[PDB]
Amino acid sequence: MANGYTYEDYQDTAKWLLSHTEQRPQVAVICGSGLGGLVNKLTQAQTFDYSEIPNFPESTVPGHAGRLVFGILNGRACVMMQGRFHMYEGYPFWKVTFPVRVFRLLGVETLVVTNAAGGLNPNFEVGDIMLIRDHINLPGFSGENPLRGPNEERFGVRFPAMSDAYDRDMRQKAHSTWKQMGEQRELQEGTYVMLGGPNFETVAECRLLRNLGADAVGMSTVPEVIVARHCGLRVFGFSLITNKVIMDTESQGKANHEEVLEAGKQAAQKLEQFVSLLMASIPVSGHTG
Amino acid sequence: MANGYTYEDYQDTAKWLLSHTEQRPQVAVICGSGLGGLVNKLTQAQTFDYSEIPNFPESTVPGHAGRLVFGILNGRACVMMQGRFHMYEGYPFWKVTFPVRVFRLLGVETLVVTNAAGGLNPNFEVGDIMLIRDHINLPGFSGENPLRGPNEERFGVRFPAMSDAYDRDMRQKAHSTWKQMGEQRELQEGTYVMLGGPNFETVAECRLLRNLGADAVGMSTVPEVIVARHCGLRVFGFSLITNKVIMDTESQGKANHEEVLEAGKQAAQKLEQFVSLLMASIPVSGHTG
Amino acid sequence: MANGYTYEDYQDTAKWLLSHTEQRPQVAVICGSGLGGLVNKLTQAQTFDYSEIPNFPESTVPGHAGRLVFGILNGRACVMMQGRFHMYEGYPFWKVTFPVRVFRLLGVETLVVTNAAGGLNPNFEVGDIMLIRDHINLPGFSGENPLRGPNEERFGVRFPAMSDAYDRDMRQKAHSTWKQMGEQRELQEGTYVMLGGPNFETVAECRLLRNLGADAVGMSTVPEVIVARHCGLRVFGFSLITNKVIMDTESQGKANHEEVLEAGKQAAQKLEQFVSLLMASIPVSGHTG
């Protein structure tokens, strides 16, 4: 595979956006986990449907609203994707990650990512929030990488590092902030593993993922962190633990799609609240001062 | 990648078949392991060459006859593919799995799968038959999955479970049946791991596969089980252990293609016999009653 | 994916070369590690730019000169690629490996491969030279293999073995030769693991690679060894350990691209010297006798 967007494609899109809103957000938020309520916290909210934005791919998967929203979250101006793209929809990674590069051209400096993942770590309970410390990019092992093809120097270098992808200063901020929240449960932190999807894992597969050191498993986020880190954005994200995966053959077995219970309800509301507060801690001036 | 067959494509193919045979099989059998003799057990046998069936891909790999056969196996009406498709032939998974969906449209409810695999478990001896308990879909980790692209609702859901892909009731049946066979060797059971191929594994690779928990390794079957489970077919299969893989650097080394000795001869004959008897145990009315 | 070159494509290219130089090399060398000095040791050197050779892909990655050079190395006639192709450039494997098959058509019998890799084994020090004993082809697990598609019988068999890819006689030669060199450090030997690239690994990923048994990690070589072994060439190669990878979260972290220090300088000069001497030990008559 190879990139199909030219540097100008991204520029035309950013210029289109800049000519349709006076808002200039410094933070971008990609909400994977059904957190519609996050958009409900936005002040001076303005929305754009993916279909009306030049060069913007369309969302298909259910629960994904499919719209870019600009607004003020806790005194901080931001832009957020209400629903993301996944390779399992048939989308190549350079399409899945198209918006991340447009964000960089809008002047955004920090990218927050969220998703819903299956807990692999035995100590995780449903509804747990997991600060992403590191990831394992399985699709990347086989060569399926959003940066495949000729490198765009105007975005970044050919061989970028990923060992420091999840901002450490912001992780310290997340922990302190969680404490202030007066939460009974502790803030988890671990390694997120990504695979293609769309089917759910088998017991054998879950065991393999865990033995490799994975703490949670999902079908997204990683490609966006790669591209964001490649073009220089500060990154940090969370995984809403919507379920504990089956590790024994004799049990409930069939991993159904009840993730919709935690999404929108239960822990999602706490995650949204958590995200709003974090906006204040985020570096750079914009949040009032 | 993305699916290239429209729901109608499958329908035209099933209707073509239904208009060329009065037989209405409830069980489909995909024979990977050189088990020509299985077709030799069919009563009222009728054959179709892949090339003459609309929308049907062609078989290339040697030993694969390349023909769909309808017939009566031990009083049970079934349809079986004499030879399957593999990704290493250049075929995308949605082509490799095309026949499984046609089977569902013919009214088939149970899919039996067989293949030849290299034994990774140290307790396996050449000629061993291994009931497939679970699998590890390596190509799937990288995103190469037969369900990639827009989901066809008329076939199944977007996020199907795989943790229960190999029917448990039929596995109990397999064990009991094997006992009745009066066999000296016990019926093995384990996790099958699939990789792309066509080359054979290296020692280092075999060690890796085994450490991950794999019991046998092959270059097929998994994509068919995915699609079959996605559209609702009951699935269960076997792996004829045609060889014990090299795990030490100083030995015979070079993994030649002598799988042809066990295939057609040795354990294949026992596997065919085993499959015929199983037909009676299979659920639903058709086998006499 | 599937091969796009016909057997004739390779033949036209070999015949073009044979009609532009009187040299008939028995050994081919693919230099991945910045070892320009190797070309500096060639007597009766003659060069061809990739762009001027029919059907020859172009090199993009920096440090890769992008030219085929024929010459006499330590009394042995050879042809060497000054810079190789990588999948991360957007190149499919059948293009990446195109030159290996042309080499076979020129009458070449031994292929030497070199690259720069990150040390995973804790006992490896920067500047270490590692004889490649075996490899783990990660892209191959997902099906991305240079041999994918219809097999060319005129080159080799459908299911080739890889368990003996790195010539053992030549490995014994390498060790003895190293001893004669009077080196303080011992010649390392291990398993090379390949992944797609272009980004560098994260700590979590490095830990995973190592736990799997990998000794060094890189983004090349493996596809060339596959194709070379498929068409019958004797293969053996080395990995210049340009760095020790981060295995702990609190450290220098960011894996920068300082590989350029060891390349051309430091250990590269020793590797070139090592390669020149090896030419004498290589089987078949040409080196004087």
Curated annotation (Swiss-Prot), chains A, B, C:
SUPFAM superfamilies per the UniProt record, alphabetical: Purine and uridine phosphorylases
InterPro entries: Nucleoside_phosphorylase_d (IPR000845), Nucleoside_phosphorylase_sf (IPR035994), Pur_Nuc_Pase_Ino/Guo-sp (IPR011270), Purine_phosphorylase (IPR011268), Purine_phosphorylase-2_CS (IPR018099)
One Gene Ontology molecular-function label: guanosine phosphorylase activity
Positions carrying N-acetylmethionine: M1
Taxonomic superkingdom: Eukaryota
Gene3D superfamilies: Nucleoside phosphorylase domain
Pfam families: PNP_UDP_1
Positions bound to phosphate: S33, H64, R84, F85, H86, A116, S220
Biological pathway: Purine metabolism; purine nucleoside salvage
Entry's Gene Ontology BP terms: purine ribonucleoside salvage
Residues given in the record as a purine D-ribonucleoside binding sites: Y88, E201, M219, N243, H257
PROSITE patterns registered for this protein in UniProt: PNP_MTAP_2
Oligomer status and interactors: Homotrimer.
UniProt protein name: Purine nucleoside phosphorylase
Organism, scientific name: Bos taurus (Bovine)
Organism ancestry: Eukaryota, Metazoa, Chordata, Craniata, Vertebrata
Gene name as annotated: PNP
